[PDB]
Amino acid sequence: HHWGYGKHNGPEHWHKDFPIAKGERQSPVDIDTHTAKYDPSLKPLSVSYDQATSLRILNNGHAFNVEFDDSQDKAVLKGGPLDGTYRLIQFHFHWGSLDGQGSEHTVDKKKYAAELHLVHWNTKYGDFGKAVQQPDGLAVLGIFLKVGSAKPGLQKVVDVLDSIKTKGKSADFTNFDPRGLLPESLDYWTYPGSLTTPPLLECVTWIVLKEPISVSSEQVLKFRKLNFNGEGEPEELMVDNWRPAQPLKNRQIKASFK
Ligand SMILES: O=C(O)/C=C/c1cccc(OCc2cccc(CC(=O)O)c2)c1
Ligand SMILES: [Zn+2]
């Protein structure tokens, strides 16, 4: 599997190896704010990241992942649309070549400069690989990034990116506090969907925050200096690693707020 984001291996090609690419609950989607309905039954959202244990940062050739110790209930997501307890395993971003594109979800067709995905798995399935085979196995918290003021809590991430420029490079990344990536408000939209990269599994409860975070142009520029390629290969900048919006089909996006 040689999937990527190029003309020859990008999202329009994925369905040949991963036919669920054309499925009934694919992500991302456009969030039409006028059509999403407030749902009073949504319980409050609980982001419990006080005991988060970050380990490592990895350039996987598609994005960079900040990996956590998920061997116990340290950093968990509960409440909102979720039943039970979801453990943080990793976060990563999707971003653009330019500030006008980069996010995977859109808001009334508006593209943000980037999108953060905090990935969590349902602890009733015991491990991540079992959780991704279940329709309620993952909860992904999605956070939009706009270019404006710098986000201080992001700077430790951007400062390490020089050490993982190319595919397969990793660096120790302990003691990173993902609380510093959150906006003030936890108002969100939620809908059932999928992973946005191969294998595109339909196992995700999406929770997308309404409030974007602001990052500086300097911060996002540093994202765009990463490489898709491995060391000693021709340089292909890691930009535009986003899948476009997919058909909503028979789904409703619910809002937690009026
Ligand atoms: O069928 C199985 O048990 C193995 C499944 C499997 C096997 C390999 C990988 C994978 O997921 C990769 C992944 C993790 C988190 C997010 C995303 C999409 C995104 O970029 O937001 C993808 C799942
Ligand atoms: Zn993602």
Side-chain angles (χ1 to χ4, degrees):
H1 298 306
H2 297 1
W3 67 269
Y5 293 98
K7 181 185 159 199
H8 303 291
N9 64 355
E12 303 318 305
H13 291 269
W14 298 343
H15 70 101
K16 296 172 274 172
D17 278 345
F18 300 101
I20 206 173
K22 292 186 190 278
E24 300 300 305
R25 57 173 278 186
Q26 290 291 293
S27 294
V29 299
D30 185 52
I31 299 167
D32 181 318
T33 66
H34 297 103
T35 293
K37 196 191 157 73
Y38 164 74
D39 186 345
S41 77
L42 282 169
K43 311 200 272 173
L45 195 58
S46 177
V47 181
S48 301
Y49 290 168
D50 178 62
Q51 295 296 123
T53 305
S54 62
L55 292 174
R56 190 175 74 143
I57 189 172
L58 167 72
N59 182 333
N60 69 6
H62 313 291
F64 60 88
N65 287 358
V66 172
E67 295 164 355
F68 286 84
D69 175 9
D70 61 350
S71 71
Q72 300 185 80
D73 281 338
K74 287 175 172 210
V76 303
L77 181 69
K78 309 174 327 177
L82 308 168
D83 289 336
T85 298
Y86 294 66
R87 211 174 275 179
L88 182 63
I89 178 166
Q90 56 108 320
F91 71 76
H92 62 272
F93 302 80
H94 311 260
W95 63 92
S97 53
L98 306 162
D99 297 347
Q101 63 198 64
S103 68
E104 295 209 300
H105 294 88
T106 54
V107 181
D108 297 331
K109 297 299 179 78
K110 181 187 167 72
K111 293 172 168 80
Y112 288 87
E115 187 175 328
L116 169 59
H117 289 163
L118 293 129
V119 182
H120 311 76
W121 58 272
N122 193 336
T123 62
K124 81 194 197 151
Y125 305 123
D127 67 54
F128 177 90
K130 288 293 216 43
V132 302
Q133 298 182 62
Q134 312 308 322
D136 61 345
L138 299 189
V140 182
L141 180 56
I143 300 179
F144 301 116
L145 279 62
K146 67 187 209 195
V147 168
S149 300
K151 192 68 173 183
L154 182 62
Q155 196 59 31
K156 278 184 200 191
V157 175
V158 288
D159 284 331
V160 83
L161 302 181
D162 273 343
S163 78
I164 60 157
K165 188 179 164 168
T166 49
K167 179 178 188 184
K169 294 196 162 298
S170 71
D172 304 297
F173 206 66
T174 47
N175 305 104
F176 177 74
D177 184 351
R179 294 175 291 186
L181 299 178
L182 309 176
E184 284 178 2
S185 184
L186 297 177
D187 287 348
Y188 64 86
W189 296 283
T190 182
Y191 77 96
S194 74
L195 306 178
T196 65
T197 67
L200 297 168
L201 295 171
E202 290 179 340
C203 61
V204 181
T205 301
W206 279 97
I207 300 166
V208 177
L209 300 188
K210 177 182 180 188
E211 189 177 353
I213 60 166
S214 291
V215 304
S216 67
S217 52
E218 298 82 354
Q219 284 181 323
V220 69
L221 279 166
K222 290 181 183 190
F223 285 17
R224 299 185 188 130
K225 301 180 82 204
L226 296 163
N227 280 189
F228 285 125
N229 57 284
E231 182 181 8
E233 297 179 345
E235 183 164 43
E236 306 163 72
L237 292 177
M238 187 177 282
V239 296
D240 296 314
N241 61 350
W242 48 277
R243 185 191 197 190
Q246 302 300 308
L248 186 65
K249 300 201 165 155
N250 185 221
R251 298 173 288 179
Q252 277 190 335
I253 296 181
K254 295 301 195 190
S256 73
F257 58 92
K258 288 174 247 213

